[PDB]
Coordinates of C-alpha atoms in Angstrom, one line a residue:
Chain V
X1 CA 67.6 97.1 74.1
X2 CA 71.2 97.7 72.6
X3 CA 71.8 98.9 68.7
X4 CA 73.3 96.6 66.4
X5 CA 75.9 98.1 63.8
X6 CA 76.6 96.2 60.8
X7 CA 79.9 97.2 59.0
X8 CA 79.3 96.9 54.9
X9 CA 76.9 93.6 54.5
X10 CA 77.7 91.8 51.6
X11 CA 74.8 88.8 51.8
X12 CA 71.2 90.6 51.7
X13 CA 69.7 86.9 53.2
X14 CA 72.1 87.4 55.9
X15 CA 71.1 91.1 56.9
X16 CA 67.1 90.1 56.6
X17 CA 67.5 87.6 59.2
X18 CA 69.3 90.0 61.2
X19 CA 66.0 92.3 60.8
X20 CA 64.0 89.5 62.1
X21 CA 66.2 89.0 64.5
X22 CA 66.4 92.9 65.8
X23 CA 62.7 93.3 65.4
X24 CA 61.6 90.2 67.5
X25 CA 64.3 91.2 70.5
X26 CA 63.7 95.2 70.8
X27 CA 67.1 96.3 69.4
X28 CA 67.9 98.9 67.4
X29 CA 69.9 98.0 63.8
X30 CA 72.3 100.3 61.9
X31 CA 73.3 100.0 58.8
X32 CA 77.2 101.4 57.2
X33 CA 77.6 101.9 53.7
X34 CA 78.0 100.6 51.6
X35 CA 76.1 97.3 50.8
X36 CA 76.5 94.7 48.3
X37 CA 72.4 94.4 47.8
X38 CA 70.1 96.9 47.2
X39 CA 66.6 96.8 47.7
X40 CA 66.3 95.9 43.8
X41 CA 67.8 92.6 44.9
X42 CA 65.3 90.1 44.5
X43 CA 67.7 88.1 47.4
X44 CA 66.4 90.9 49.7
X45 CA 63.1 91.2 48.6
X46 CA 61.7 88.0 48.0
X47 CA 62.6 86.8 51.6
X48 CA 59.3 88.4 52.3
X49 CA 60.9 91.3 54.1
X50 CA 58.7 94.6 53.6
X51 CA 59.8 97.2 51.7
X52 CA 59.3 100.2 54.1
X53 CA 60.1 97.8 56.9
X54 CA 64.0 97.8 55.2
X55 CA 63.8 101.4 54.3
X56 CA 63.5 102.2 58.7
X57 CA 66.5 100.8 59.0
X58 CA 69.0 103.2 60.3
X59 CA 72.2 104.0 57.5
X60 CA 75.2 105.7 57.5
X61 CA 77.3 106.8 54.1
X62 CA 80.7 106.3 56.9
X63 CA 81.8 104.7 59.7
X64 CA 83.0 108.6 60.1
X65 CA 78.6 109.6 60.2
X66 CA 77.7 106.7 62.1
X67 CA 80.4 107.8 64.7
X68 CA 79.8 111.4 64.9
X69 CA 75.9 110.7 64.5
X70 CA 75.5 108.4 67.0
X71 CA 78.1 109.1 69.5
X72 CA 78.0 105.6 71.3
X73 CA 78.5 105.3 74.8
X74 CA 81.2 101.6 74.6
X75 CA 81.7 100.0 71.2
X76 CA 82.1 97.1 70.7
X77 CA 83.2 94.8 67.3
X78 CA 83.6 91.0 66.8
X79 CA 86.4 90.2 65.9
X80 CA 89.0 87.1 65.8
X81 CA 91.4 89.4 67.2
X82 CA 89.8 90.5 70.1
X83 CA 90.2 89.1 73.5
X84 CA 87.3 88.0 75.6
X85 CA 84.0 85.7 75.2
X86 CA 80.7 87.5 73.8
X87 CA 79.1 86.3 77.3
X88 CA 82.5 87.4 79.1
X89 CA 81.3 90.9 78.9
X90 CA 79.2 92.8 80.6
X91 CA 76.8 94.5 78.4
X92 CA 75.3 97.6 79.5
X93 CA 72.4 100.3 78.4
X94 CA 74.1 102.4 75.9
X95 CA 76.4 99.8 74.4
X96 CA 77.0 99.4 70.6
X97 CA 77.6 96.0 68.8
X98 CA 79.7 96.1 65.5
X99 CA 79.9 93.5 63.0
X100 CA 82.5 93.0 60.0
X101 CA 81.5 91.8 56.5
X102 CA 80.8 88.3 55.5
X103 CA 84.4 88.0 53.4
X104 CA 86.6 90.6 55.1
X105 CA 87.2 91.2 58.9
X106 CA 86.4 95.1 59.9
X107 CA 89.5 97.1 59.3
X108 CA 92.3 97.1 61.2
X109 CA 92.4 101.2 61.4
X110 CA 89.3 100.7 63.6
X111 CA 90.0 97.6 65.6
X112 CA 93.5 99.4 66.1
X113 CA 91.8 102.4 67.5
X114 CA 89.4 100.2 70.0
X115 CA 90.2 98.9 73.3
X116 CA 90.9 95.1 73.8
X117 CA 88.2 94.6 76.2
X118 CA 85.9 95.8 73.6
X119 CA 86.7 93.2 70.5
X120 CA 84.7 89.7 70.9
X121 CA 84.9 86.8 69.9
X122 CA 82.7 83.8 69.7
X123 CA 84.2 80.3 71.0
X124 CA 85.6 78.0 68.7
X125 CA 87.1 74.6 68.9
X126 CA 90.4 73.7 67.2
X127 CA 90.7 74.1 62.9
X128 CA 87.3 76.0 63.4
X129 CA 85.9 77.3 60.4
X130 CA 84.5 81.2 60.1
X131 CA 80.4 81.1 61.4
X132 CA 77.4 82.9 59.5
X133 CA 77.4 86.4 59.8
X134 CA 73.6 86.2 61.2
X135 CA 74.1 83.6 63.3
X136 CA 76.8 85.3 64.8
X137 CA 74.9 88.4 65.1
X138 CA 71.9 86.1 66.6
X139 CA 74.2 84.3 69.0
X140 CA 75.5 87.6 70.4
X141 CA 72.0 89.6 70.5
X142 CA 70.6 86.6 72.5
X143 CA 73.6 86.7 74.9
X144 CA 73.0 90.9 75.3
X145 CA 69.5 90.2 75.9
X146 CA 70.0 87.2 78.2
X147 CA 71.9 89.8 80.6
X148 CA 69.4 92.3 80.4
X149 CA 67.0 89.9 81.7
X150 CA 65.2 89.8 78.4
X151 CA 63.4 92.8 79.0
X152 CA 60.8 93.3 76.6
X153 CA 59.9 89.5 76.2
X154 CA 56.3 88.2 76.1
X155 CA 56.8 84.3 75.9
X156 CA 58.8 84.2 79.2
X157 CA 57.1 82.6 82.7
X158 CA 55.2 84.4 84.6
X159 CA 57.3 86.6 86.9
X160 CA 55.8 88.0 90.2
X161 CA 55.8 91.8 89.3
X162 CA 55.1 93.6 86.0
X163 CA 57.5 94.8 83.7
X167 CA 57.1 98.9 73.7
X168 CA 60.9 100.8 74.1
X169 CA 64.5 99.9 73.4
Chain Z
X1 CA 79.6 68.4 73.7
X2 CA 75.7 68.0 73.7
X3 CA 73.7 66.0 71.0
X4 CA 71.7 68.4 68.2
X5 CA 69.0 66.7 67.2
X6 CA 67.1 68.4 63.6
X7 CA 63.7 66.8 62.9
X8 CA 62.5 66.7 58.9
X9 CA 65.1 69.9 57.9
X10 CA 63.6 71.3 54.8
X11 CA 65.9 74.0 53.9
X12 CA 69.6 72.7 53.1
X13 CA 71.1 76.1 53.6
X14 CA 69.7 75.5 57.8
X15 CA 71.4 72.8 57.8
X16 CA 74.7 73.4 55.9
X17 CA 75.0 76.2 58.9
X18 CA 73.9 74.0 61.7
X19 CA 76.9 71.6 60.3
X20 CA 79.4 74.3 60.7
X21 CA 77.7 75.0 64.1
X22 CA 78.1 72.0 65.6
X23 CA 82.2 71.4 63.9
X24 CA 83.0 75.2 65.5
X25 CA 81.8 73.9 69.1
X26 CA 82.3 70.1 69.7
X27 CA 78.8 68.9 69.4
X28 CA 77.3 65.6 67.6
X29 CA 74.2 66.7 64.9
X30 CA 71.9 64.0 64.6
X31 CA 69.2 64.3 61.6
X32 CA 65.9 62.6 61.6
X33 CA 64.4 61.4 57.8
X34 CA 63.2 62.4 55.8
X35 CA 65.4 65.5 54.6
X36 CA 64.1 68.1 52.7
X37 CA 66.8 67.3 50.2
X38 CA 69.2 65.1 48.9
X39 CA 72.3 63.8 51.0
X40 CA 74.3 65.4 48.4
X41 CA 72.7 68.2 47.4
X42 CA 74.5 70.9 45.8
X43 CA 73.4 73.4 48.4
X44 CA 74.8 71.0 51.8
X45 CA 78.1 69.7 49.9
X46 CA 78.9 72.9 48.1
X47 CA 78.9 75.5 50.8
X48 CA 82.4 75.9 51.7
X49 CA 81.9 72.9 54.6
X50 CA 84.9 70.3 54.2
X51 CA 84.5 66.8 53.6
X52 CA 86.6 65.6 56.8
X53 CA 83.7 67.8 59.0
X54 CA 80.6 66.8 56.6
X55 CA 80.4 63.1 57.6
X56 CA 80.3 61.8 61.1
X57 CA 76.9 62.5 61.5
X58 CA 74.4 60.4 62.2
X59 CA 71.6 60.3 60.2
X60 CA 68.0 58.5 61.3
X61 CA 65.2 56.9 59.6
X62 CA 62.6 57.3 61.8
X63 CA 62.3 59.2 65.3
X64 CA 61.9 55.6 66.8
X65 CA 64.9 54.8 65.0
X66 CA 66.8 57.8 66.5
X67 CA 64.8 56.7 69.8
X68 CA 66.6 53.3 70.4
X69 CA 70.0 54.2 68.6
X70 CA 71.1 57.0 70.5
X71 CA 68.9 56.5 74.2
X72 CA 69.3 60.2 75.4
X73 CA 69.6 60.4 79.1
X74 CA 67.4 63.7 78.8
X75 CA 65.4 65.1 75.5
X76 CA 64.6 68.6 75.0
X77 CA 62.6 70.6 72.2
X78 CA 62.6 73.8 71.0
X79 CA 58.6 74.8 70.8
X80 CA 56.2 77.3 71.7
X81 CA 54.2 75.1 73.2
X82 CA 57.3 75.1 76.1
X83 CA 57.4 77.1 78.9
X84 CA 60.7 78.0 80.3
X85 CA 63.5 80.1 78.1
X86 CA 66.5 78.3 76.4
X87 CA 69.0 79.8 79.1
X88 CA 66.9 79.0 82.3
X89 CA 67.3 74.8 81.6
X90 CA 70.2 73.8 83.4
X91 CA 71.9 71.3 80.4
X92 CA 74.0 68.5 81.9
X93 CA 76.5 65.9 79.9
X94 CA 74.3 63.1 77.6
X95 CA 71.3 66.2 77.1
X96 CA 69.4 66.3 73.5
X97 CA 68.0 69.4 71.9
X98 CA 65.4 68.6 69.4
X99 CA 64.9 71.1 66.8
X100 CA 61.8 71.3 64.4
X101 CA 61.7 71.9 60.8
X102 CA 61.3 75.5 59.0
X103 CA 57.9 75.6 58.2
X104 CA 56.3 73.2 60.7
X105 CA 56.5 72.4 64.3
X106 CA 57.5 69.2 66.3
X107 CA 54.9 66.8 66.0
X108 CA 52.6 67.1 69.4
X109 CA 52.5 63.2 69.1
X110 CA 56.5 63.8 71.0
X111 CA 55.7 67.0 72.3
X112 CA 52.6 65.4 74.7
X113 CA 55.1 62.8 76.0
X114 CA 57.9 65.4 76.9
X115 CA 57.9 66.6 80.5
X116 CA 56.7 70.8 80.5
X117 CA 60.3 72.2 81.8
X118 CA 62.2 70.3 78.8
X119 CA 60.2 72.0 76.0
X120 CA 62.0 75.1 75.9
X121 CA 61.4 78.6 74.1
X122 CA 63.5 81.4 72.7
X123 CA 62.3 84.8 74.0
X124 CA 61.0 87.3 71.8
X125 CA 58.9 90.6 71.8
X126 CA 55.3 91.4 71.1
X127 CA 54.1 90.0 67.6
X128 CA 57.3 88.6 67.0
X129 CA 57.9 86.6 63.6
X130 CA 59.4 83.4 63.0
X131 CA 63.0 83.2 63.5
X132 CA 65.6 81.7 60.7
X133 CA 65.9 77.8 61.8
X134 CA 69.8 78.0 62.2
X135 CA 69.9 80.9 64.4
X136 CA 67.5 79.2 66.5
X137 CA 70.1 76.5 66.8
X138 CA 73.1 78.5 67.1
X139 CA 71.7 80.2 70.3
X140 CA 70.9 77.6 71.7
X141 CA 73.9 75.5 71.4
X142 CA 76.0 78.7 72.4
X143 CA 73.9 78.7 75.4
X144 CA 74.2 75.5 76.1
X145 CA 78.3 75.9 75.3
X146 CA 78.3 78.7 78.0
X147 CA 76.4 76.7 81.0
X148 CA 79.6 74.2 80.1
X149 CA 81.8 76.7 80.7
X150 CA 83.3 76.5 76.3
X151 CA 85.2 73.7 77.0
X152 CA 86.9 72.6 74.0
X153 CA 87.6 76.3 72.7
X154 CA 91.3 77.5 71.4
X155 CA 90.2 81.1 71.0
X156 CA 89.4 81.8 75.2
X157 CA 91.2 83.7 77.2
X158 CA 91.8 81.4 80.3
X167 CA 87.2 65.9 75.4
X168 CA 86.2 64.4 72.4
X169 CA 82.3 65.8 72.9

């Protein structure tokens, strides 16, 4: 489906679920360096995530190469300083889904660069506190895929006329 | 907003998550015993959650228990032994999602009683894996959230539950 871009990941548990999450919903996952695991972190590796399986994933040494590598047709970051809903926009084909670090929001010489319409938030209720990276991630994928029709999926019901691709 | 309802959580981590969950977006978490850990295990209390958000939970002894306390109007269940997706129920006011632990599913002893179109499922792809307990919350209580329209969020553009 879409291609998931996460922006210097600092947790290895969270980015494994994140995997899981891509691999079991059809969308593509990019890495930007740098990380704060390597695969020599037992965090990483003894979550019973393959080693090759890791290694597929998409990197980038700069925000700079991922942009001029992937040339995205919308991006998109979450951010608390963006303005609408994760389900409040309308996700399309070619679209690219950022993600800031655990600790630190993405930098504001990106964000500053990005249209409003393009920073999401998830909802919160008053003297919220900040929400796991991966659910967060999870959340949003789900949303993305929900208005793609979850094209791809195998454990829907059964729907009148037939439907391996992102 | 809607009541979460976590069956035998193993994995305190899950839950420390689902906590925050359900604080961020209004709704009540209900755990059914026993835990998978201890009610002040270093892993729950620890985690950055405050102690003002940590409490007003209820917690249950046995399903039965949790069966005659609360009296849902409507239970639900994540399984997938369900049939319809997560965000084709239509979740109304007094609704209870039921949630099974990590490793093992909700008994079919509850499963069997439960009408086909509340046992609900989260899509996923051919030879799909197991998905991470508190994201398989978080979705669906930000689905749920959505058919409600987010009431009881400060961070939207345009009561107590």
């Amino acid at each position: 489906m879409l291609d998931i871009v996460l922006y210097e990941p600092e947790i290895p548990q969270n980015t494994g679920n994140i995997i899981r999450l891509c691999a079991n919903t059809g969308f593509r996952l990019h890495l930007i360096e740098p990380l704060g695991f390597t695969w020599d972190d037992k965090r990483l590796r003894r979550s019973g995530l393959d080693y090759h399986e890791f290694a597929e994933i998409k990197r980038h040494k700069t925000f700079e190469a991922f942009l001029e590598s992937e040339k995205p047709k919308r991006l998109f970051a979450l951010t608390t300083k963006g303005c609408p809903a994760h389900s409040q926009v309308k996700f399309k084909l070619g679209d690219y889904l950022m993600f800031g670090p655990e600790t630190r929001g993405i930098p504001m010489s990106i964000l500053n660069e990005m249209p409003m319409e393009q920073k999401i938030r998830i909802p919160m209720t008053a003297n919220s506190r900040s929400m796991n990276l991966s659910n967060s991630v999870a959340v949003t994928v789900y949303e993305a895929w929900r208005q793609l029709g979850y094209k791809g999926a195998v454990n829907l019901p059964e729907v009148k006329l037939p439907e391996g691709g992102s």
